[PDB]
């Protein structure tokens, strides 16, 4: 049951590119999973291939002896690229475990609790309007804006996520001063961007009718003072919840007790360690959990600690199938599960790169029930999509 | 005054590598900072070389501005390796911007305020107990121990520190179960490693004679519980201080609540965000900052916020020349310094791969006035001395 | 490099005067401020000649070390008129360090992050009500109010900020209690008070169209329960902020928890310590800092105190043109900019006492590139505007 | 009963000067206060020269009308070298009212409540050793250390402070880091500090034998970190007070916390609103008031306010007879009075200064039952002895 290998592959993904950790055992079991460097973490693919070599040898049984044995080699640096670097890791050991004990990987975790999971379509239209290159019909004004959350509706989904646009001052664009685009490092926000929000989400709104559900995702784009801003501009507007990520513990939960709507974050967070000073705070109705970057294991101690809080956790799923399936296994096992994120649009290459994709009904995500995570990452699938040199850098 | 280029180097520092970045301008100024992957930070490399390349281009003078979109471009991953990768060029920008200016580094930091830096002498008797191939006399026993104090003495140094010796159970060994050797993940605490610290000390004592001040290092070494029996168990004993590195505020503070010796920490922390919590806490008699890790503007405001506290502050400075330099215009500029770590068991090679080496008189550095830092890596030196594929991976 | 002197000069500025720091290095190179004894602050001069006497000799260079020796020699009366001297001849010393290395003051500073600063045009109608001799056109009803806010608007600024005026007791005033006129200094804010804002702030609205900005400013005119009821009354307006001066931190954190406007405050405050309580206490959704009194190295220690609760900061500009070049510096270097004050409205004589004057385009102040802050009082011109025996007193 | 004048003098004190507030009345009452510029205070007498043109022409016996409309006017810049302004002139105020009156001036502050206040002998043997010049016999050494304690022994006074001296290294000297002498702003302790605080107390205490109690003043002479390191030294000591001056509350109450020995501090606050944080802290065990300082009418106030928290009060007295009388009243009145500071080693022209001196018998002060303070200066005398161009500057 030795770990022989664990190797990393790579392939375009259109404006950056998928990351893959192949874990193969002694017995030929391979072992999957994806992460990401696009998403301000530059250096994954260094810390797993150093963490790899530790690994080889080892138990592919034992993989919280290799995460305590991890977390002591990178201590002093823990969290960020080093914990994506060791998440990466845990989810591929988790596969193979799973595969080697011939069931899906929710059967490591406590076994299934439900058989769909309800989803939102997030970047939605977010990714028609920046990406249009990738994804189609392009968006270019607040008439697609209403045509896309009508295609929502539509095709049965129960819920959409938008983002900041601009849509009175040139070619319709995001407002990301949070990633530097436009670098005002201040994060002020003015009326333009006020204005702005409330035309796109009333056109949503329209689109929508009254039983699709808005969430609107702010990222990192204010401060607390622009928060306040932006819900009292928005507050007679109906909101699933309003994403606001922050590392002041206080100056979050400042803005949820001002907040006439639900508040999620913890996104990009690491650890029960990371979420404790939030969650003392008041600071969230919702807690987003990204098993990509934590690791699944490592994440379901996250999902026990919010649900002693009475906190329902999301998992944060904006990658390809493989991230869907992980996710989806999350899903599956965690009984405070708010809801689940997806992006329904999907690159034209998207289902060549993988052996299966995720199944929808009725707006809910079908749990597959095939050995290890239920989708693998094709090699020469990958090679037909060479990487580019992508992301928020 | 545009940056032309960024790239990195690396050179053999016998268990470890030493890493560079250089950074040069139009002008054909070239500044260099040091940095570190050893100490449990795969991926600084990686970080550097991505962010560099939105760095040429831009004007060296403006090395707030680059942090400024660095912070966001990476914002959702900061802290850890993503942040040493930020550190590492914040320190290179300033070297060039200093020379650039003509003037010592500490002449953007708001002007020297001494001209001597009283040192202690780190890593004592640990890395010639740890390292004998590359540092002698290899200490082996007790006598050793005593000796090697005697040495600090003898040459006139006012303060060594030393870390977890295992004594009475084979060879000589260090105790570093936080970073997995040996492998005991609970890191618990048990008489042997207290009859062995009070062992190692004592012996310390002995050669250190009465006016040689005793700092000891426990590192990730125990959990709180530990702590406070090795505090216990050490009671009677006079230190200058006992470092204790945690992610647990509360926890370190009710450490420090129980400890009869000043407590210090820090040295893994990023930014005000990060030291914030601890100080709010109580949790610290000193602060100790990586400026090579923050960088050195961004520890500046580190050691301001630390002051308001009425907290002094000590620059972590374990790496090569360049590093003590960087450190030593911090030293330079700081109000309220505590002491500076340096190491004065040197590589055979050391004094080879830079053009200047750190002068100390009386226990005390001697802050250098030439154009940045005070020391230049060697180019034709570094590749003379090849790395290899070490710290504590 | 030696400070040869440091006097203080003085001429008359309408209704107060205005005051600077002049410090002459060995060689011939003259650094200035500009500092203000009318706002509450009598004392000033007498405090800088005497720490003056005690820089002439020492390194222009070394100012952190000049702050630190100041800050020693006066620990027991620091903050208030101490602390405005120490930060006017800080300010007088990083003039004479810029112009020592032929930069602009914001080189000292990260360097510039941005070109151009937006700002609000302050004591807008505020100074053509109260200062009529000075500054044109008188205004003196609500229609001139309305007037203002059209100049303002056609002028291309993007924001005003007035004060508390009743409208409906004889000749138009303001009403000032927090600082005696009149002298009531229960400082209750009663049904005159409420009525008379209101009518001055629709006034205003109504001049100012809606892509214009208002800030109200209460200084220090009522008690916690006086501010409520105004927050209350004024809960329909749109307002920028609402600036509220206060000592103490948990009763403005009170308000501000009740308020449905931005609160902002600090104005008068010194240094990390004296901000601290009242970013603890989530008392402010803006800080304003005073960089004339607390000199602008001192302020940018306090910026990135701000920066680490995700404050953003305002300097306070409401002197002479050099304040306004000392303010614009710190703008240009400071990330977490919120906004920045000054004033429109300028004396017949302000362009005559200095060698440059600031230059606004679209509603913004662009920031200068001359070595020193880019303008110098002139010797020959102050003398011809000899003072008065003003301000507040 | 309007106030006709007021005006300031002063006069040569040794080492410092004196100063005075000298304020007269329509019907020809004179009432005098006497302040102080050389404790890090310049700008005083212009705070006076300023203020005093409002009063001229109100009521004497309006006093706090005069504190509530001078704190309105100089609000922005309020404490320091201001409120050290208004408490002269409320000082000067209480004397004429209650000389107006023909009562003594406890007889404004609720009455007499003791007829002797147990002193102790303050700067002792600070000012023999600091000052020989003007007071003797001069102390050089540990034995001279030892005499005084037996002075003031034989002399009947029950209790001594002390400071900070080094006497293993050269000439005895004062070691006084925190006013910069010498500059070492980090004000560390080591070795060399607790060893000399030590060895000086041992003879302070052989002289002093076991009936006379030992104050120990460390003024601002370290960080918390130090405060500790003396506190835990000397922890064997029998003090009375171990006397620390903070900025921080949270760090004094964690000094205190681990404190074998009464603190007291506060010498330098002025109003409840300073007092407030360090009570609400735990900060002390007894709280020094500054009646020079604040007016003594407002340190009733904040008498008061610590009596409400069971803490009890001692003035700061160290200054000339007039000093002595004011803070004799304030002592005659207030309920909760730990003990009252004063200094037995006199100027060779001290009587002569004033019309009447301070009576001590067996270790106590006698309070006076003369209209006013109970002693006013003799202008000719001031005139005798012209001030110099002293204290801290």
New interface residues.
Partial sequence: LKVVSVDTLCCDAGWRNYHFVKLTTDEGIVGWSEFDEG?????????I???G??LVGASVMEHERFF??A???????????????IGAIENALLDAKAKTLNVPCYELLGGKLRDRVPVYWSHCPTWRINHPKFFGPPVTDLDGVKRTAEEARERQFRAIKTNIFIHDDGPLHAWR????VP?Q??L?VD?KVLRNLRAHLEALRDGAGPDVEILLDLN?NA???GY??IL?ELADFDLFWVEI????P??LA?VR?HSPHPISSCE?LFGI?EFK?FFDANAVDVAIVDTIWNGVWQSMKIAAFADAHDINVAPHNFYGHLCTMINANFAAAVPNLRIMETDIDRLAWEDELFTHAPEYQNGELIIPDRPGWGTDPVEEAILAHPPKVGG??
């Fill in positions: 998403f301000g973490s530059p250096g994954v693919t260094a810390v291939e150093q963490l070599k530790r305590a044995e977390y002591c080699l990178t201590r002093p640096a823990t969290g960020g690229v080093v914990s994506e670097g001063p949070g990633f530097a670098f490092p201040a002020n009326r990192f401060k607390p003072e306040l801003k009292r990520d922050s590392y002041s206080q100056g400042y007790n990009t360690r000073p928020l850098l």
